[PDB]
């Protein structure tokens, strides 16, 4: 309600750009010394997107423990996320090492491998059952088990094997294929339909490690996804939509990784998604079916 009131006031004042810039100005600035070491230059996709030292994920290797990935630990909401860049051709083994070591069950990919004529992410998972991937540097094997292809997203079941111990784990890969870089989803319905698909899988459950979320830089689309999820979880705990301060939650998230939410319209969309999702949180379970229809997933 208060969230809806502010939305209307910002929309009427046409002040989303000013609100968004205020977030950028107030956001945390912490050191990223490890990310900027010369030996790690080729492990970073973007010069101006780096993990803070205090929240970076460490690989459990003695050689070089660096990956461009951050642990977003939301204490009040009691949920954690790992946000990371789209893997590079030389960091795909590191990426799956992180998934293994952090005990994650789900990977959420919000970008395509090719966007706007450029390569934004390595092809880090297998596309055919019979052509598995072996990451020799990290001693992992990855096999495609099945895939459920919808109109604007695909869910894949993967098997990740630790070749050292022969232990295997099911990984669920949620690929949103129609969300443009520096853009927004087609509608709140299409976004929420996808988010609750991830939730229903158990990939966000506290009995698993943190879900891994990435786009190309791991801040814009990735930040929008986690902001909406965290706001809806906070609302769920109290059944109180007016108790959720979206800008305060975003500033809290930005303590753990820089640059979350990359445009003013992504911030506006985050409000829209949370305002619409509140319908389900506050007890209208039928709205989930409506989102599925409006998403045209079939």
């Amino acid at each position: 309600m208060e969230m809806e009131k502010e939305f209307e006031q910002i929309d009427k004042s046409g002040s989303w750009a000013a609100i968004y810039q205020d977030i950028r100005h107030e956001a945390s600035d912490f050191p990223c010394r490890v990310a900027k070491l010369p030996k790690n230059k080729n492990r970073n996709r973007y010069r101006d997107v780096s993990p803070f030292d205090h929240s970076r994920i460490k690989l459990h290797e003695e050689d070089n423990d660096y990956i461009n990935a951050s642990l977003i630990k939301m204490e009040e909401a009691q949920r954690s996320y790992i946000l990371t860049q789209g893997p590079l051709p030389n960091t795909c083994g590191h990426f799956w090492e992180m998934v293994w070591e952090q005990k994650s069950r789900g990977v959420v990919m919000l970008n395509r491998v090719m966007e706007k004529g450029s390569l934004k992410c390595a092809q880090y998972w297998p596309q055919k059952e019979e052509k598995e991937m072996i990451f020799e540097d990290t001693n992992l094997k990855l096999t495609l088990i099945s895939e459920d292809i919808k109109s604007y997203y695909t869910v894949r079941q993967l098997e990740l094997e630790n070749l050292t111990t022969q232990e295997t784990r099911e990984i669920l890969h949620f690929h949103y294929t129609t969300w443009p870089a520096f853009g927004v989803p087609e509608s709140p319905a299409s976004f929420l339909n996808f988010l609750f698909k991830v939730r229903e899988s158990g990939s966000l459950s506290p009995e698993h490690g943190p879900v891994v979320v990435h786009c190309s830089a791991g801040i814009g689309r990735s930040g929008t996804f986690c902001l909406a999820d965290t706001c809806l979880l906070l609302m769920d705990k109290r059944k109180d939509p007016s108790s959720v301060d979206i800008k305060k939650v975003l500033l809290e998230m930005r303590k753990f990784r820089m640059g979350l939410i990359a445009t003013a319209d992504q911030l506006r969309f985050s409000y829209l998604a949370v305002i619409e999702g509140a319908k389900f949180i506050m007890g209208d379970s039928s709205v989930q079916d409506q989102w599925k229809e409006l998403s045209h997933e079939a």
Side-chain angles (χ1 to χ4, degrees), residues 1 3-4 6-7 10-11 13-32 34-40 42-60 63-135 137-185 187-206 208-236 239-292 294-295 297-298:
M1 206 51 61
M3 168 190 307
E4 298 171 9
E6 180 175 16
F7 184 90
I10 303 170
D11 242 22
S13 309
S15 46
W16 285 107
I19 293 293
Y20 178 64
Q21 283 308 318
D22 291 337
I23 292 166
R24 290 192 160 179
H25 172 85
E26 303 162 26
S28 298
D29 191 15
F30 295 116
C32 305
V34 177
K36 286 306 185 176
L37 292 176
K39 64 171 176 178
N40 291 327
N42 66 12
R43 294 183 178 211
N44 293 315
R45 183 175 284 280
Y46 297 100
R47 185 195 69 178
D48 298 337
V49 179
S50 298
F52 300 139
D53 294 324
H54 81 90
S55 53
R56 78 183 179 93
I57 297 290
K58 299 184 168 71
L59 302 173
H60 303 173
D63 185 59
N64 186 342
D65 70 9
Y66 177 76
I67 180 170
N68 192 317
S70 303
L71 175 71
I72 317 304
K73 188 170 173 177
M74 300 304 285
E75 184 190 350
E76 188 187 2
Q78 286 291 289
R79 179 162 290 170
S80 290
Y81 316 81
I82 291 171
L83 270 60
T84 189
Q85 66 184 17
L88 291 156
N90 58 317
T91 71
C92 292
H94 307 154
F95 176 93
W96 289 113
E97 178 187 358
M98 170 178 70
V99 170
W100 183 270
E101 293 168 349
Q102 301 304 309
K103 300 179 192 304
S104 306
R105 163 168 176 77
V107 174
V108 174
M109 171 174 184
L110 303 172
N111 66 291
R112 288 175 299 149
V113 164
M114 174 162 293
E115 297 182 333
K116 300 177 187 305
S118 300
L119 293 169
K120 290 301 181 175
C121 188
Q123 184 60 54
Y124 66 88
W125 74 95
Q127 301 176 277
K128 297 187 173 179
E129 289 87 340
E130 68 276 12
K131 293 211 78 85
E132 76 276 7
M133 297 180 78
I134 297 180
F135 304 94
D137 61 334
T138 53
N139 216 231
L140 294 158
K141 178 185 176 184
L142 183 62
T143 307
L144 176 62
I145 303 305
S146 63
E147 47 176 1
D148 182 18
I149 301 167
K150 303 293 187 167
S151 71
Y152 70 101
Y153 72 91
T154 293
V155 186
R156 299 178 186 95
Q157 181 192 3
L158 309 173
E159 178 167 299
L160 185 62
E161 177 174 5
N162 185 337
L163 293 177
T164 301
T165 68
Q166 294 212 321
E167 186 192 325
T168 65
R169 293 181 193 163
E170 177 171 276
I171 305 299
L172 299 177
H173 188 253
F174 303 86
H175 190 181
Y176 200 120
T177 65
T178 54
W179 189 343
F182 302 101
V184 296
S187 64
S190 66
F191 171 84
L192 292 166
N193 182 63
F194 177 87
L195 171 61
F196 281 90
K197 204 79 188 303
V198 179
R199 279 186 171 202
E200 290 184 338
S201 78
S203 295
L204 306 177
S205 156
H208 301 298
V211 66
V212 174
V213 185
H214 79 86
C215 44
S216 191
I219 61 175
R221 287 166 288 184
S222 296
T224 301
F225 179 91
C226 298
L227 179 60
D229 184 57
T230 288
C231 287
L232 291 166
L233 184 58
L234 292 165
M235 188 182 305
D236 212 358
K239 298 297 189 180
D240 186 351
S242 282
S243 76
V244 179
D245 183 341
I246 296 179
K247 303 188 300 294
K248 179 179 174 174
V249 174
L250 178 51
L251 281 172
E252 177 71 22
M253 296 170 44
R254 279 189 177 220
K255 298 174 180 178
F256 300 91
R257 184 171 179 86
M258 62 175 62
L260 302 183
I261 307 286
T263 73
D265 201 41
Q266 285 180 350
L267 178 65
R268 181 179 190 277
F269 185 87
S270 293
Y271 272 76
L272 288 181
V274 175
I275 286 161
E276 174 69 16
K279 292 180 183 170
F280 176 78
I281 300 308
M282 295 308 292
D284 178 8
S285 279
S286 80
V287 77
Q288 199 175 352
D289 282 328
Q290 299 174 49
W291 298 336
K292 192 173 96 148
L294 295 166
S295 80
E297 68 163 33

